[PDB]
């Protein structure tokens, strides 16, 4: 599938040119999501620590 | 211009080939002219003509 | 290679 891949590559480059012209960051959503996932891991670590200190019976 | 560049790369067409060849040819012209100028300085215009 | 040629012509 060399022909299809070469055409898809051309399409991707044209899409990138348009995105740059429009000043649209195609990776903004993924960046924000990765930051949010880091935050989730932090909060889960805090909750896990409280559950290890107090135990499930007490917490629930 | 960016769309034209993307197309040119897809087609494998070197847009600067002609200018490259021209600059090489201009170097060759300068070399040959230097040789002719040297012969004209050694022999003089009257003899050469 | 008619398809590839036609696409390259369009390009």
């Amino acid at each position: 599938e060399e022909i299809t891949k070469d055409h898809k590559v051309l399409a991707r480059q044209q899409l990138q040119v348009l995105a740059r012209y429009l000043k649209m960051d195609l990776d903004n959503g993924e960046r924000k999501f990765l930051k949010e996932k880091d935050t989730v891991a932090e909060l889960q670590a805090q909750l896990d620590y409280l559950n290890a200190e107090l135990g499930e019976f007490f917490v629930n």
Side-chain angles (χ1 to χ4, degrees), chain A residues 3-4 6-7 9-60:
Chain A
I3 65 199
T4 180
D6 193 13
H7 193 19
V9 164
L10 162 62
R12 215 165 305 118
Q13 293 183 93
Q14 286 156 331
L15 185 153
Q16 276 165 222
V17 167
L18 289 159
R20 160 155 60 266
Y21 169 64
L22 290 156
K23 312 186 193 305
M24 67 176 52
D25 195 333
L26 309 181
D27 280 321
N28 189 329
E30 188 65 11
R31 286 195 212 84
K32 294 187 301 188
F33 165 68
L34 293 166
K35 271 182 76 276
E36 218 58 9
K37 203 171 172 56
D38 283 1
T39 298
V40 169
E42 160 219 16
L43 297 167
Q44 188 64 58
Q46 286 172 252
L47 276 160
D48 285 0
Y49 184 77
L50 277 176
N51 276 274
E53 269 300 317
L54 303 170
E56 184 183 26
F57 200 100
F58 190 105
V59 170
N60 297 339

